[PDB]
Design a protein around this nucleic acid. Structure first.
Ligand SMILES: [Mg+2]
Ligand SMILES: [Mg+2]
Ligand SMILES: [Mg+2]
Ligand SMILES: [Mg+2]
Ligand SMILES: [Mg+2]
Ligand SMILES: [Mg+2]
Ligand SMILES: [Mg+2]
Ligand SMILES: [Mg+2]
Ligand SMILES: [Mg+2]
Ligand SMILES: [Mg+2]
Ligand SMILES: [Mg+2]
Ligand SMILES: [Mg+2]
Ligand SMILES: [Mg+2]
Ligand SMILES: [Mg+2]
Ligand SMILES: [Mg+2]
Ligand SMILES: [Mg+2]
Lengths: 62, 216, 124, 51, 19, 128, 225
RNA sequence: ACCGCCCCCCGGCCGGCGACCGGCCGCCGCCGGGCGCAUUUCCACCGCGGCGGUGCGCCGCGACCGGCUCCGGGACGGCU
RNA sequence: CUCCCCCCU
RNA sequence: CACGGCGCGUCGCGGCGCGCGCGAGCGAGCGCACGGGGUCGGCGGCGAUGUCGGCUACCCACCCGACCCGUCUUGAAACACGGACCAAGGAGU
RNA sequence: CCCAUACCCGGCCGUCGCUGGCAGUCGGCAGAGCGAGAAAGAGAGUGGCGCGGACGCUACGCCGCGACGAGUAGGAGGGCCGCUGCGGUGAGCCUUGAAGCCUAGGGCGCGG
């Protein structure tokens, strides 16, 4: 017996894109490798944003 | 080159030396011991000569293979295991065989063998057991001893001698070795009164006696 | 390319058979007959295959050539080797290694050749 | 890595703390010397009592 | 001496002296 | 002297008895197939002492020896000769089984081909 | 070429080996110094008590600065305040133990949870045995058993703790970074007390096991670890 | 008439021909045929031969090493 | 990777 | 005694501390093991129509445990209600 | 002295966390490392015979460390669990015997 709570034990963030197309998944492969074998956090941010959904990637105007 | 000297410190306890690092630096006299910086064979053939390659490649690889094993240190083959012996067991002691075909027969013990088995024999003239091997665990060592420090047993007998072969026929070498051993053993036990009958008898448990109570 | 068609075909191939918690690949030039990116014989530009000879004895080695990628008729070159096991394996090893031709399949090709050869030897 | 007990494994203890070796050597030698001293003193006392 | 940076030359000194 | 697998480890099973559905002994209409009880008063659901055990994930066999036959191989079902050559390289760990629909005329050919290819068949004499 | 590169490889290797040898010598001498300091501290109290008795006065020893706490009650039915204090002290499981430095805050915190804990003043041997046998480090939020000095050296290098001897000395003497050392130390999981307890529910003074026992915590530790 | 875009021809660059090559030369590999002719090469058999790997038809025993435990016997020392 | 001495086979 | 070179030695307080050079931070082998999780380079028996192995599954015996499910309910084994048994159909579209 | 599903040590299953590691299979065209207390180059340069080397990697994959695992009402995920029909695909199976049904036979899966 351990005095702990398991409510917030599991984090909800995305591990991979929910999309099924192949080009985005190839991009995800490449940037996964880049993020895990490079110390730069720009790659990590880009890969995380690749994982995101459509409404979380709003269009940017000229 | 250089004759190999013995270790300079007696073992105080297993893994700990008697003398420290500086005492060793002194005893080794290292203050004046400073130091500073196939697969082919040519053969003639009757042509010319051929460079034959021994260790040639295999003509069949299996469908799949197991990987190597991780390395471990404390594991040694049975050949070079350290052999232990009970304190109560000394040459010339009477033992009681507990598990062999010779159940509960009093037998004289002679020598510890190389693989740890006890070379044992009660002169088969009286209790009917030859030169034999017996595991030290499966015998009860009673506290009655004779003096056999002044007897000679042949050096040729060993575990290779007693190793089983392959109907078993006793060999003349076995007979002569048994006679040679017993011709010296028997007079020693005949000196002690009422010992031959004791060896002839067979140990047993009757009701009302318990091993944890009785001493031997 | 190659990874693109691999992503296309990794789960929707006619050569795919999945049963008994297993998965196997069927297309001809596939050593180890298993579904993987390395051993898939239709995706890569450089491909190695080992098949039993049409005759009851021998081994056919198939190498994908570099030019006619979109011309299936003239895309594979086949060589039949009918000798002792040791020299057959040596020839296959030399072909794979000294040509720098898809070196990751050298041991797989050798293993498959050895097998075909044993099969070809009469039973007891 | 399997964790062995330093309190029971001499070389594990030495790996973690080399000075433990000198401590154990010193205490073993000291105990042996003290026991010899007490034994000889008891023998001398018994001899004097017999005298 | 045990410091990786400032003890480099002292370590070199003792290493050469051992010879 | 049948063909032997590459390695024969000691298969250990946490449980060997089947999991019997609660009250399946009292009735014939209740099949032996397991169903998780959901009654508000069910002893089996509440895990009372001396009752029918309920399957947990804890009984799962280890991954190294999961699905292994007692002979040490892993099963694979085949319907014709052509599927047999799939198991050419999964030789020392995967055995073949002829599907029950295959006629004897094709069964003899499949078993003889497997004999050539050194693949073990668990039912080689199924029609004789 | 690489006629220089090959020798540079082994030059780097030799440099690293010499550095390791120097570090080993450093920790060995530090352990020797710690042993001397412990002997000095042990004899000082005896000397002061003797001189006070000779003068006819009394020598009250300093109040202990370090305590060991063991949780001796379960999870079921705990008041929220007691639960919060136990969480803060890191006793979330029965027969868990930890070190606490003493002050007004610690005294009151322990008084709140007296019925649930048995605590006392640990001995040097108790600290040694607890660190060596049950001592695990909290590295990268993971419970790692301390099987090498480098694990300690990385997590506590900035505080000049570089081996088991530094960790034990700092814990026992309540150093400047006792907070960091204790927090790096994962809570000890002790076995059930061999030979049994007297009475879990009541206080130690009235014949139980809860509450403060000055130095009997060492007797308790000997059987709980 | 003008502007933008696109197709085609010619001329000049840049890049690719690994989603897209031909000839020449060089190196290497493979195959078929002769040369080669048996201290080479290969195939099959025997030894209770050796090394390495995996296992024993079933039932058993022993040894040492390590981890975790329970207990016993010694000896040494400190406040006292 | 120096040199001596002692003891037992 | 986890002491071990020569120097220039103030890098110095009076020597110890403690710095600068010394082909410039490279001596090598063997061997034992309380050393990043077990090996034996150790053995013994019984095997053709009476014996070997078969967790589970067939029947039986024994020890311990063990009240009949579904449902409403604070509370169900209930002296609360539905249920003789079996097959098929049967309810968030 | 006795024993709980409690505590300690060990094995195994699963979940969660490390948003951990692996594209480096870099091979006679090569040189086999990035575990090691200390933020960062086995940095590039210019002057005083025998042809040889296991597995891998369905990246939706494989591998390594820790912690944890009660559950009604209820919520969510995965089912290579199951039933019927349709588009593809298996040069699939089948009168040398399909579907269905029965079984003291051999097995797999925690379970369906
Ligand atoms: Mg738990
Ligand atoms: Mg939640
Ligand atoms: Mg209820
Ligand atoms: Mg209570
Ligand atoms: Mg007890
Ligand atoms: Mg109460
Ligand atoms: Mg009863
Ligand atoms: Mg109702
Ligand atoms: Mg309710
Ligand atoms: Mg009524
Ligand atoms: Mg009603
Ligand atoms: Mg009714
Ligand atoms: Mg129905
Ligand atoms: Mg555990
Ligand atoms: Mg649950
Ligand atoms: Mg039936």
């Amino acid at each position: 017996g351990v005095d702990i709570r398991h409510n917030k034990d599991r984090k909800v963030r995305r591990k991979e894109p929910k999309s099924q197309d192949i080009y985005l998944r190839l991009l995800v492969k490449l940037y996964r490798f880049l993020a895990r074998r490079t110390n730069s956090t720009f790659n990590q941010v880009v890969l995380k944003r690749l994982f995101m959904s459509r409404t979380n990637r709003p269009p940017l105007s000229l | 080159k250089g004759k190999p000297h013995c270790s300079r410190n007696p073992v105080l306890v297993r893994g700990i030396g008697r003398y420290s690092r500086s005492a060793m630096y002194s005893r080794k006299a290292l203050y004046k011991r400073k130091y500073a910086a196939l697969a082919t064979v040519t053969k003639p053939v009757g042509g010319g000569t051929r460079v034959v390659k021994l260790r040639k490649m295999p003509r069949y690889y299996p469908t799949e293979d197991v990987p190597r094993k991780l390395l471990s240190h404390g594991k040694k083959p049975f050949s070079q295991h350290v052999r232990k012996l009970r304190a109560s067991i000394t040459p010339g002691t009477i033992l009681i065989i507990l598990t062999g075909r010779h159940r509960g027969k009093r037998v004289v013990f002679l020598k510890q063998l190389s693989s740890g088995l006890l070379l044992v024999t009660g002169p088969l003239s009286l209790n009917r057991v030859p030169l034999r091997r017996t595991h030290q665990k499966f015998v009860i060592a009673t506290s009655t001893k004779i003096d056999i420090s002044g007897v000679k047993i042949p050096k040729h007998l060993t575990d290779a001698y007693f190793k089983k072969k392959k109907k078993y026929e006793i060999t003349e070498q076995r007979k002569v070795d048994q006679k040679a051993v017993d011709s010296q053993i028997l007079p020693k036990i005949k000196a002690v009164p009422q010992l031959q009958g004791y060896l002839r008898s067979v140990f047993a448990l009757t009701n009302g006696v318990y091993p944890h109570k009785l001493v031997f | 390319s190659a990874h693109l068609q691999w992503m296309v075909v990794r789960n929707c191939s006619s050569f795919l058979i999945k049963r008994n918690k297993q998965t196997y690949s069927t297309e001809p030039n596939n050593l180890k007959a298993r579904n993987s990116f390395r051993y898939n014989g239709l995706i890569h530009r450089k491909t190695v295959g080992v098949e039993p000879a049409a005759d009851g004895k021998g081994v056919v080695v198939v190498m994908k050539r570099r030019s006619g990628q979109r011309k299936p008729a003239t895309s594979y070159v086949r060589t039949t080797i009918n000798k002792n096991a040791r020299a057959t394996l040596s020839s296959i090893r030399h072909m794979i290694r000294k040509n720098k031709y898809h070196p990751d399949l050298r041991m797989a090709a050798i293993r498959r050749a050895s097998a075909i050869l044993r099969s070809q030897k009469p039973v007891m | 890595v399997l964790k062995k007990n330093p309190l029971k494994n001499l070389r594990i203890m030495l790996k973690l703390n080399p000075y433990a070796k000198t401590m154990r050597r010193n205490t073993i030698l000291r105990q042996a010397r003290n026991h010899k001293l007490r034994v000889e003193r008891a023998a001398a006392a018994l001899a004097a009592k017999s005298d | 001496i045990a410091h990786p940076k400032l003890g480099r030359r002292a370590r070199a000194r003792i290493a050469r002296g051992l010879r | 002297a049948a063909l032997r697998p590459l390695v024969k480890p000691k298969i250990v099973k946490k449980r060997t008895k089947k999991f019997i559905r609660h009250q399946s002994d009292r009735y014939v209409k209740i099949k032996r197939n397991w169903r998780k009880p959901r009654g508000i008063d069910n002893r089996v659901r509440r895990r009372f002492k001396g009752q029918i055990l309920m399957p947990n994930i804890g009984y799962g066999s280890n991954k190294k020896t999961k699905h292994m036959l007692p002979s040490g191989f892993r099963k694979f079902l085949v319907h014709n000769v052509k599927e047999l050559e799939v198991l050419l390289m999964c030789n020392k760990s995967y055995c073949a089984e002829i599907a029950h629909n295959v006629s004897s005329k094709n069964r003899k050919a499949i078993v003889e081909r497997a004999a050539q290819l050194a693949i073990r068949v668990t039912n080689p004499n199924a029609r004789l | 070429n690489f006629a220089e590169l090959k020798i540079k490889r082994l030059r780097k290797k030799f440099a690293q080996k010499m550095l390791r040898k120097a570090r080993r010598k450093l920790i060995y001498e530090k352990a020797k110094h710690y042993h001397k300091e412990y002997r000095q501290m042990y004899r000082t109290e005896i000397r002061m008590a003797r001189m006070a008795r000779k003068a006819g006065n009394f020598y009250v020893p300093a109040e202990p600065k370090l305590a060991f706490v063991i949780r001796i009650r379960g999870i079921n039915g705990v008041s929220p305040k007691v639960r919060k204090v136990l969480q803060l002290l890191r006793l979330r499981q029965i027969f868990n133990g930890t070190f606490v430095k003493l002050n007004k805050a610690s005294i009151n915190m322990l008084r709140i949870v007296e019925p649930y804990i048995a605590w006392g003043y640990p001995n040097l041997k108790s600290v040694n045995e607890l660190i060596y046998k049950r001592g695990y480090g909290k590295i990268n939020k993971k419970r790692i058993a301390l099987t090498d000095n480098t694990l300690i050296a990385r997590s506590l290098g900035k505080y000049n703790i570089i081996c088991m001897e530094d960790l034990i000395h700092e814990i026992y003497t309540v150093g400047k970074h006792f907070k960091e050392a204790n927090n790096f130390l994962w809570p000890f999981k002790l076995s059930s007390p061999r030979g049994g307890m007297k009475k879990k529910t009541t206080h130690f003074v009235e014949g139980g096991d809860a509450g403060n026992r000055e130095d009997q915590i060492n007797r308790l530790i000997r059987r709980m670890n």
